[PDB]
Amino acid sequence: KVEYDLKRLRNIGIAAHIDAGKTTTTERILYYTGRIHKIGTITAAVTTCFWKDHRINIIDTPGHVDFTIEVERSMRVLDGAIVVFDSSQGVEPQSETVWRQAEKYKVPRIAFANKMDKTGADLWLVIRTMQERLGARPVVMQLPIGREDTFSGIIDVLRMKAYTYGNDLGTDIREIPIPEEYLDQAREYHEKLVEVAADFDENIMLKYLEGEEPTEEELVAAIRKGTIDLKITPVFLGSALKNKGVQLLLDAVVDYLPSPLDIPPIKGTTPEGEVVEIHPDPNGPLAALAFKIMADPYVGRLTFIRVYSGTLTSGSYVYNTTKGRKERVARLLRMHANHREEVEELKAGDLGAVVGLKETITGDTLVGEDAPRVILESIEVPEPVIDVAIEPKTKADQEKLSQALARLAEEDPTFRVSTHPETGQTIISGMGELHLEIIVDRLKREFKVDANVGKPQVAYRETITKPVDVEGKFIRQTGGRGQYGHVKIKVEPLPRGSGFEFVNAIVGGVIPKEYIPAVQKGIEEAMQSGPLIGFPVVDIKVTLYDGSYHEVDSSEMAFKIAGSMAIKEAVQKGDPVILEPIMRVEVTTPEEYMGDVIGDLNARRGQILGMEPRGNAQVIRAFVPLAEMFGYATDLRSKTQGRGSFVMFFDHYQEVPKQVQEKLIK
Amino acid sequence: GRYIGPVCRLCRREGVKLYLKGERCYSPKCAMERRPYPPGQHGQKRARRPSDYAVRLREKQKLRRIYGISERQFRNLFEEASKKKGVTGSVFLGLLESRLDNVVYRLGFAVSRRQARQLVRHGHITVNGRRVDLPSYRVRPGDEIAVAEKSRNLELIRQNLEAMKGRKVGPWLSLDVEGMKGKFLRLPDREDLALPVNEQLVIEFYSR
Amino acid sequence: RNLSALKRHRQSLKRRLRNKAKKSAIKTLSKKAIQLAQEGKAEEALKIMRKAESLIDKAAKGSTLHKNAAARRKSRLMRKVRQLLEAAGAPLIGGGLSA
RNA sequence: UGGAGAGUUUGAUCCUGGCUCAGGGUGAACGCUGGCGGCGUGCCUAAGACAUGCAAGUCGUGCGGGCCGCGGGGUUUUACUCCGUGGUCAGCGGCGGACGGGUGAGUAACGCGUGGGUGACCUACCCGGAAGAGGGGGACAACCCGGGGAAACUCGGGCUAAUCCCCCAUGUGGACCCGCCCCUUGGGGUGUGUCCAAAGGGCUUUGCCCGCUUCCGGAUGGGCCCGCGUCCCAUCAGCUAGUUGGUGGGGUAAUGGCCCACCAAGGCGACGACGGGUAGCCGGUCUGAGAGGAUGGCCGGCCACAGGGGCACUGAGACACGGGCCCCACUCCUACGGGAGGCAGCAGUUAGGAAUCUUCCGCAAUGGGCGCAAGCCUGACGGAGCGACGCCGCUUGGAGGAAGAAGCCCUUCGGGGUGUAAACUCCUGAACCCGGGACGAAACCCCCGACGAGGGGACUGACGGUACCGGGGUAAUAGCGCCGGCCAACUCCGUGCCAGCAGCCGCGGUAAUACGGAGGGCGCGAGCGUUACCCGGAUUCACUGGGCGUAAAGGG
Ligand SMILES: CC(=O)O[C@H]1C[C@@]2(C)[C@@H](C[C@@H](O)[C@H]3[C@@]4(C)CC[C@@H](O)[C@@H](C)[C@@H]4CC[C@@]32C)/C1=C(\CCC=C(C)C)C(=O)O
Ligand SMILES: Nc1nc2c(ncn2[C@@H]2O[C@H](COP(=O)(O)OP(=O)(O)O)[C@@H](O)[C@H]2O)c(=O)[nH]1
């Protein structure tokens, strides 16, 4: 009564750039692996399905679409993955990406060519790309009979048999021998295959040279032992919609896709600090990762988890080391394609959802309630890329919003909410247009909040050009508490990024000792609302070089004003200049697109600074005004179809083109 | 837990010598033998006159410090003697005195109450058979306090049981060094307990 | 999802439906009697009333009526009937009403 | 067997008097710490809404069948499968689903409390007593056949059994009207008339067991009434039409405007009616010297309500929490023709909130329904779980050990402190190990007996391989508050009306026991502190226990 050998476990992920067939592919896989039917929705992240005495977990979700992040998370937990490819989309600019961010982590994956029935459906074309773009080492595993509209059956080279599909409802299949012609075509690829697997099993190499043919069992071992290393990538096919190539790709699964045990251990840390492999032994400390919370109508808060060590038990007690919290796991649960199989425990390597836990958010490491309180890795850092101004209309909505993120921040920690620490407006940190966009629906619907969507403001700054000296008088002498204060200063502009410097230029002491502090807090003060827009008048040196007093009238306060006057006017007089923020940005782009990329950047009030290559791509650095820098995301990914990325840093402030001086006078 | 930490300190402070330790305090050095004065930095200074309150506090802390026993417990047993039928003052002592950890020390099985309590804990003691390990056990009149058997031949037991040939035990107690026994004759009595403590104060103290 | 206690309802309905009838039986009849009795039909009223009476105590066995349910009804029936036959008639036939 | 005060109006005083503080208490929450265990206790807010599971059933010894496993097979082989019995499925009928469990919304009231009245009544089951169980008819499910359906199911024929229904009988005897008798609100008789009983199973089979029928009593539980007691507001003063009474009817188990019809103008109110708020009541709880004040969690009694409203059916009982009908609101499936519903049961989900737990084990015991029993059901209950939430107990060590290391702090630099504290020395050994290991459980049942007493005998543990015991056995968690006075506990350095403290009086403006740190000290200790709320202090609403010439207060 084993039913769990682990070497029988398949955790896999469906990735690929949109259009593709990811989603539709899954539901299909979930109908074959479970058509069952005996006379007896991705409904939650991961799901189980059985294909020939092997339990498979699937987590379709990728999407690529702007915001990867999640894809790159499931990726970390799962062991294998199918990179769905659209046969059709052949001058395919986006077949890429997906992958180059797979080897990124270190996981094995096979290929699937989905629309072999739709126009332009040209298998080879793809391979003329899958080695030309990303450049892997794929291996043709099938040859379709009837390209596109004439989609009938298929051939598996390795196993030289021909199959057919007489319809597309997913019924009339069959293994009909090779149809007259084709044949020849086979051979050669079926030799290369073996020839390719030669680079793994020497056995299948010498027997190649001698004239003996490799065993269908050692041949498989090659292919499989080759994928797993991230060297080779078995390419297969079939219209997922026509129900074709699937039942065969399903075999392709197991036969080549890694089992939790062929997988390289997760490292975790002791509470002190030192790495260490977490062995998939369902008998060692209990360590499991979490990865996705979800609100269920039926059971409520769910915490999908990937076990690594030990074995959780239903109705036990855990310990999240991450937020040092002692949780009481109550119920364990596995998602079947149509119902909720309530299991009783989850052994290392396995996946599902636990019910209970309140403090366990994403990426949380759960050990035993006495076990060595350790913490896995998980640390991913994908920040945001596009944000926007959100003013919640009348102060009423300004609240619905507060809850809006107070629950939406937990239900999606791939974003951040920030209230401009100087000026109410709140930014919506996203990772792609769409991202923030779809939140504007939920946040505006399911929250009924209805507010404004402009763009951020810019932290401008006031200063002057010419240095000036004016009088600071105050005096109000009428009959008693005189109020007598007066001073003269020396104002002088400083390098953009100089700061605040004053000057105790008072000799003997014509201006009594007690008051100076006050004449600074006055000057210091004033410098707040600029003479132009009302912004931090900065980058200046101030010189108190004179001023008098009255023995009785003077006042600590009287001086604060006089000084606040000399300041409040030297700026007005020394010709003001609206400084603004300049950023440092570095766009990584294939010098392919570069051409315009630089352009675009020039036509953006910016001036270039260099370009010292990176990766296979090329970086460009330069400065820019935050104003004409907004939503650069959906502009960089425009000039680059996706292959572009940038960063941004502040650096200094600097004068506006005057034409933009009177622009700002509102 | 029963305090733990500097003792021949409190010996001081209360400025009325105590044998928290037992043996040593007897030697020239009960601490207060050497420097008879409240601890701390200041300590040896002309002391301002204590308040009406300060006084009674210190008499409580004295009485309670002697028996070494959580204010908590201490209070409960007082709040018991009051309602109890009988001159409260005496009474209070009466129970206080019936603590097993005390009867043990009284019996001399232990040089100090500090010690006596540990003994009690480790079952080195027995009452009428069943060992007790609760220092708070309250002895009724007519019980045998004996040393367990596994224990009987353990240094400590002896040395202390040894100096006992000679030493008296309360007119309310009868001891037999051989069998390592001892009965609780009667409820100790006001005089029988020669204490540098005044109960009236303390009472007045729990009357506010 | 469900409970077999509607068995109890199904009955609830039967019984009601039963006595519902002997109920309205005696009713009408009770009337046809006193009607005469008052109308003057001395004995032929006594007749019917003699019948009604039975039908009553008869019903009283089961669960329709009970306790004095019956006896009350009677102490009114062969109360008013004799209190209408005194409208000059002289109790004829030996119906229920005692001499 | 019981009663404490203190700070603050002034230059000073005395009075009056407010404010303030110490005490207790908590279903608690919050901070910083947090080791074990026992018994308690844990939605106080949204009576807001709610996925899932389980919370009520059971009798074959009431009855006829369907299906399935046994006997024997009907026939010559399975066939039209009969027969006796034990599972089953639902249908009958019998009881039980009205107890138990939840909750406090409503309600200021015969709801509650108490104490009484029923010449105004009821009570399934259970005891005791008396007499019976005589005949006949009769249908409907189940079932078969047939139709409509996505579904839930539904419609039409035709059979048939019973402890199902129904007629006739006999009536120990009971029900009515009438007469007389006792009695005294309708209570007991008594004669004439009239009306009414019943059921059959099992076995060992004219005798038991379990039932049935009627009548009388016992018991238990109720229904209804009545006196008294049951909050704030007169800036609510008048209220009342089925209204108050009456007669006759209805209605009921029974009284009664509880209802109807008709007559009479009456019924209530400063002894506070009416109107408006708030609240479930009590045993009790906390505080208090006491009176008195507050209070009503868990536990026990009673009531009320089960989405909001209206209603009746069945029935001993209900206007029924997991029954039903209608209005309305919400929740869901849909082949969109129509279905299914009600967690204030247990547990959990969500929302709300400062906050309140596991979709846990067991019917082992107790207790409940059904059964002759075996036995079945039983989130009732018996346990486990999480939580310093509370209480109680226990531990982080004990005895030695310097005119007294170091470090650190104060210093008048002589020295003073931490401090027997450490060190170091011996000794005991929580935890934790192997081992042993319960009480709760003795009946129902079965056998002797007489299926009575009594005697013997067997099966029975969720907690639990837990508690607890014996052997081994390592020095093995400390915090938190405070140090001007009330108030125990003081110095150094910072700070310079800043920053900050703060319950009150008040501290801070270059030497602050009142800020901030340090050393030191005090209190208490798996806790310590804070914040809510109630009593006390407050004789500060004064009955006990106060006052009004000028303090507040004599009405022209
Ligand atoms: C089912 C799944 O795996 O992905 C689905 C679900 C998806 C990954 C969604 C994209 C994006 O909203 C994702 C976010 C982060 C969006 C913001 C929040 O709401 C998160 C709670 C949500 C988690 C998953 C979600 C909701 C998918 C899309 C959306 C594509 C949109 C268009 C217009 C084609 C996709 O896969 O194409
Ligand atoms: N015709 C055809 N369309 C397909 C096939 N696979 C996917 N599609 C189309 O791909 C589109 C998006 O499918 P989906 O899997 O959701 O895309 P993803 O979520 O980006 O992977 C839909 O239009 C499908 O009709 C296929 O095999 N044949």
Phi, psi (rounded to 5 degrees) for A177: -40, 165
C1’ D340 / CA C3, Å? 14
User: Where in the sequence of chain B do the CATH 1.10.1050.10 domains occur?
Assistant: 7-96+194-207
- A417 vs A429: CA distance, rounded Å: 6
- A104 vs A100: CA distance, rounded Å: 6
> A104 and A115 share a domain?
yes
Phi, psi (rounded to 5 degrees) for A121: -50, 80
Helices (H), B82-206: 88-97, 100-107, 113-121, 155-162, 199-205
Q: Which residues, including other chains, have CB under 8 Å from residue A430's CB and lie 6 or more apart?
A: A67, A384, A385, A386, A387, A388, A415, A436, A439
Q: Which residues, including other chains, have CB under 8 Å from residue B181's CB and lie 6 or more apart?
A: B144, B145, B146, B175
Domain that holds residue A433: 410-460
The strands making up A471-473's β-sheet, listed across from edge to edge, are A471-473, A486-493, A540-546, A500-501
In the CATH scheme, what is the code of domain B7-96+194-207? 1.10.1050.10
Does A394 map to a domain?
no
CB-based contact A403:A314 (threshold 8 Å): no
For A367, the token pair is 């050990």
> A85 and A126 share a domain?
yes
- A92 vs A240: CA distance, rounded Å: 19
Residues 41-80 of B with CB under 7 A from strand D: 41-45, 50-54, 56-58, 61, 70-73, 76
Phi, psi (rounded to 5 degrees) for A487: -150, 165
Closest CA to A579 of A543, A622, A536, A550: A536
For A121, the token pair is 């459906």
Bridge partners of A128? none
Query: Which of A432, A460, A488 corresponds to the end of one domain?
Result: A460
Q: How was this structure determined?
A: cryo-EM
Phi, psi (rounded to 5 degrees) for B31: 90, -65
Instruction: Assign C10 to helix, strand or coil.
Output: helix
C1’ D350 / CA A130, Å? 49
* Homologous superfamily of domain range B97-184: RNA-binding S4 domain (3.10.290.10)
Amino acid letter for position A187? R
Residues 32-91 of C with CB under 7 A from strand D: 50, 53-54, 56-58, 61-64, 66-72, 74-80, 82
Give CB contacts under 8 A, 24+ apart, made by A212-220. A216/A158, A216/A159, A219/A158, A219/A193, A219/A194, A220/A158, A220/A255, A220/A256
* Nearest-10 crossing angle of helices B88-97, B71-81: 130
Q: Find where tokens 């030697």 sit.
A: B27
The domain spanning residue A456 has which CATH number? 3.30.70.870
> Who lines ligand 2 at CB under 6 A?
A 16, 18-25, 114-115, 117-118, 239-241
Closest CA to A577 of A457, A652, A459, A466: A466
What's the number of domains chain C is made of?
Answer: 1
The closest residue, in CA terms, to atom 14 on ligand 1 is A412
> A82 and A224 share a domain?
yes
C1’ D554 / CA A520, Å? 69
Q: Which residues, including other chains, have CB under 8 Å from residue A336's CB and lie 6 or more apart?
A: A34, A47, A48, A49
CA atoms within 13 A on the CB side of A567: 31
Domain that holds residue C35: 1-99
Query: Which of A460, A478, A494 corresponds to the end of one domain?
Result: A460
> A643 and A540 share a domain?
no
> How close is the Cα of A65 to the center of ligand 1, in Å?
10
| Residue B86 CB in 7 A reach of strand D | no
Closest CA to A98 of A119, A77, A71, A124: A71
The closest residue, in CA terms, to atom 20 on ligand 1 is A412
Breaks (C-N over 2.5 A) in chain A follow: 40
Q: Which residues, including other chains, have CB under 8 Å from residue A325's CB and lie 6 or more apart?
A: A319, A359, A360
Provide the Cα torsion A171, A177, A179, A184; round to 10°.
130
Phi, psi (rounded to 5 degrees) for B120: -45, -50
- B143 vs B100: CA distance, rounded Å: 11
Q: Which H helix or E strand runs over A24?
A: helix A22-32
Provide the Cα torsion B156, B157, B163, B164; round to 10°.
160
Q: Find where tokens 């928290």 sit.
A: B20
- A613 vs A592: CA distance, rounded Å: 12
State the DSSP string of A322-353: TTTB-----EEEEEETTEEE--SEEETT-EEE
Q: What is the resolution of this structure in A?
A: 7.8
Q: Which H helix or E strand runs over A249?
A: helix A246-256
Backbone Cα Rg of chain B: 18
User: Where in the sequence of chain B do the CATH 3.10.290.10 domains occur?
Assistant: 97-184
C1’ D175 / CA C78, Å? 13
The closest residue, in CA terms, to atom 7 on ligand 1 is A61
The DSSP call for residue A278 is E
Closest CA to B113 of B29, B24, B16, B21: B21
The domain spanning residue A179 has which CATH number? 3.40.50.300
The domain spanning residue C89 has which CATH number? 1.20.58.110
CB-based contact A82:A373 (threshold 8 Å): no
The domain spanning residue A490 has which CATH number? 3.30.230.10
Nucleotides of D under 7 A from a protein CB: 2-4, 22, 51-52, 56-58, 90-94, 96-97, 121-123, 165-168, 174-178, 191-198, 213-214, 249-250, 252-254, 313-316, 320, 322-324, 341, 348-350, 358-360, 385-387, 392-404, 409-410, 416-421, 426-430, 470-471, 475, 477-478, 486-491, 519-526, 528
For A511, the token pair is 């201006």
**Angle formed at CA A242 by CA A236 and CA A244, multiple of 5 degrees:** 30
Is the minimum distance from the CB of A276 to ligand 1 under 6 angstroms? no
For A172, the token pair is 């009339």
- A291 vs A293: CA distance, rounded Å: 7
What's the number of domains chain A is made of?
Answer: 5
Bridge partners of A147? none
Amino acid letter for position B67? Y
> A172 and A247 share a domain?
yes
Closest CA to A239 of A564, A27, A518, A21: A21
Helices (H), C42-96: 42-61, 67-80
- A485 vs A559: CA distance, rounded Å: 5
- A307 vs A279: CA distance, rounded Å: 10
For A531, the token pair is 């003479």
Polymer length of chain A:
666
